[PDB]
Amino acid sequence: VREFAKEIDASCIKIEKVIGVGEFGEVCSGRLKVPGKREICVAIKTLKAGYTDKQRRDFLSEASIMGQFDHPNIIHLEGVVTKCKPVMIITEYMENGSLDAFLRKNDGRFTVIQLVGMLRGIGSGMKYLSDMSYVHRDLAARNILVNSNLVCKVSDFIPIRWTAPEAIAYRKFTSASDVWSYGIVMWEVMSYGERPYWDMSNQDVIKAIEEGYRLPPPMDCPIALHQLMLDCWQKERSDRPKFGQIVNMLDKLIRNPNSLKRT
Ligand SMILES: Cc1nc(Nc2ncc(C(=O)Nc3c(C)cccc3Cl)s2)cc(N2CCN(CCO)CC2)n1
């Protein structure tokens, strides 16, 4: 048996403002208050006006997939509204928005241990997804959300410079190509949201990677963290660490913080 999205009575939802817009539709912030339970802030996603039946189905599919996941580092689904129009997907509200934006607005503001904690959370969520045979395909800081307590959660259920060479060249997407992407996310985090490969063109990036180029340590990045990035970017996908190993390695760095001394 599979999980599913719970139906939420529309009277329990109060939409407060629009906080994002896309080609798919839009996202709002609001409040959810169910009888007997404390009010929580939520995010509310809707389809573009005039959506078709097919679009409505593909939409309620993002919800059914999300309903399968219950982990502290994966965005939490509250439920759906389907008995009323328009259709909506409701999740927890992540107060600090996307990780890329958040770090760029807070350049230099966190400690190494805080940053490593964020990476450990992302890794834990990815271990959970990969455990379940899911492949994200689009792992990047822009697709991670952050709450008030700095907890990072995987969201978003070809970006060339986040994508493993075998996924670009042979369309082979696996957890191991997600691990490559995770390495890029590590670099984004430790650089406070710099653009991977800077001004290099997509073509230049592809050629450089094939010739053995890998990104350098971000400014003031511990060597141990950069070495882990390099492990994630092994050419042969089978040579990359698994997500469980990544999390274990981060846990060991956090437990033995002197290991973060060398830069
Ligand atoms: C675009 C945006 N989202 C934020 N938080 C979100 N939490 C959950 C989100 C989400 O999309 N859920 C979701 C849904 C609903 C359906 C399917 C799949 C998913 Cl994953 S979006 C915060 C934010 N900020 C704006 C700027 N800042 C200043 C403050 O006023 C900080 C806050 N902006």
Side-chain angles (χ1 to χ4, degrees), residues 1-202 204-263:
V1 293
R2 317 173 235 106
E3 305 281 328
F4 65 98
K6 301 176 178 61
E7 183 78 18
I8 294 173
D9 181 356
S11 76
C12 296
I13 293 159
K14 177 176 64 182
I15 305 171
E16 283 178 355
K17 64 178 179 178
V18 182
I19 61 181
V21 298
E23 197 75 20
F24 68 84
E26 69 190 19
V27 175
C28 299
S29 62
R31 312 305 256 280
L32 174 65
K33 176 64 181 75
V34 172
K37 304 300 177 179
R38 66 167 174 174
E39 184 192 73
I40 59 167
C41 293
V42 289
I44 304 157
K45 178 149 104 170
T46 50
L47 286 172
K48 60 180 180 180
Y51 57 80
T52 62
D53 279 19
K54 177 188 188 300
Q55 288 171 324
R56 185 188 189 268
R57 289 198 309 270
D58 297 343
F59 186 62
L60 292 177
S61 288
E62 175 163 34
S64 282
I65 273 50
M66 299 159 58
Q68 311 305 314
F69 306 134
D70 179 27
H71 185 277
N73 297 289
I74 301 292
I75 186 75
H76 180 81
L77 176 72
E78 293 293 333
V80 293
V81 177
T82 68
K83 292 167 55 179
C84 304
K85 302 175 181 61
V87 63
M88 300 175 167
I89 298 174
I90 318 297
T91 70
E92 67 182 318
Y93 176 67
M94 303 291 283
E95 295 91 346
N96 281 316
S98 61
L99 177 62
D100 59 336
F102 179 65
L103 292 183
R104 290 172 194 143
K105 298 184 185 180
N106 288 280
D107 193 310
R109 301 288 293 180
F110 303 117
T111 64
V112 172
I113 281 294
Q114 284 178 307
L115 295 174
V116 175
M118 297 173 187
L119 289 172
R120 197 271 187 199
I122 298 161
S124 186
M126 291 304 306
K127 180 185 181 183
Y128 179 87
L129 289 177
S130 56
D131 281 351
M132 298 178 61
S133 321
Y134 192 82
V135 183
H136 192 290
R137 308 196 169 196
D138 202 26
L139 179 60
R142 65 177 206 270
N143 292 327
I144 300 307
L145 293 166
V146 188
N147 72 18
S148 291
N149 289 321
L150 303 190
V151 179
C152 294
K153 305 191 186 199
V154 182
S155 171
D156 186 34
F157 295 106
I158 300 98
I160 293 302
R161 61 196 67 212
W162 278 263
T163 303
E166 76 277 4
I168 297 170
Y170 306 102
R171 292 290 299 187
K172 181 66 171 173
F173 288 85
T174 65
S175 61
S177 56
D178 279 350
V179 163
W180 181 285
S181 302
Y182 178 84
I184 303 292
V185 173
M186 291 182 70
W187 193 90
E188 288 186 280
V189 169
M190 300 309 297
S191 70
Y192 286 89
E194 280 193 79
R195 181 163 193 76
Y197 310 96
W198 316 275
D199 53 280
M200 294 172 69
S201 68
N202 285 347
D204 289 335
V205 168
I206 291 170
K207 182 167 177 294
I209 287 297
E210 167 69 16
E211 305 295 305
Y213 177 79
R214 299 294 187 269
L215 291 165
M219 302 180 287
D220 298 320
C221 182
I223 301 300
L225 289 174
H226 186 239
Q227 183 60 54
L228 183 49
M229 295 173 203
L230 289 173
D231 295 343
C232 292
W233 302 328
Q234 284 287 338
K235 186 205 303 180
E236 308 298 334
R237 70 178 167 279
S238 46
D239 286 332
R240 300 175 200 148
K242 311 303 180 178
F243 278 115
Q245 296 176 306
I246 289 166
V247 170
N248 187 57
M249 284 181 276
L250 294 170
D251 280 342
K252 290 177 178 173
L253 296 175
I254 292 164
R255 168 146 23 87
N256 301 289
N258 292 119
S259 61
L260 295 169
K261 174 76 179 182
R262 300 179 184 178
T263 62

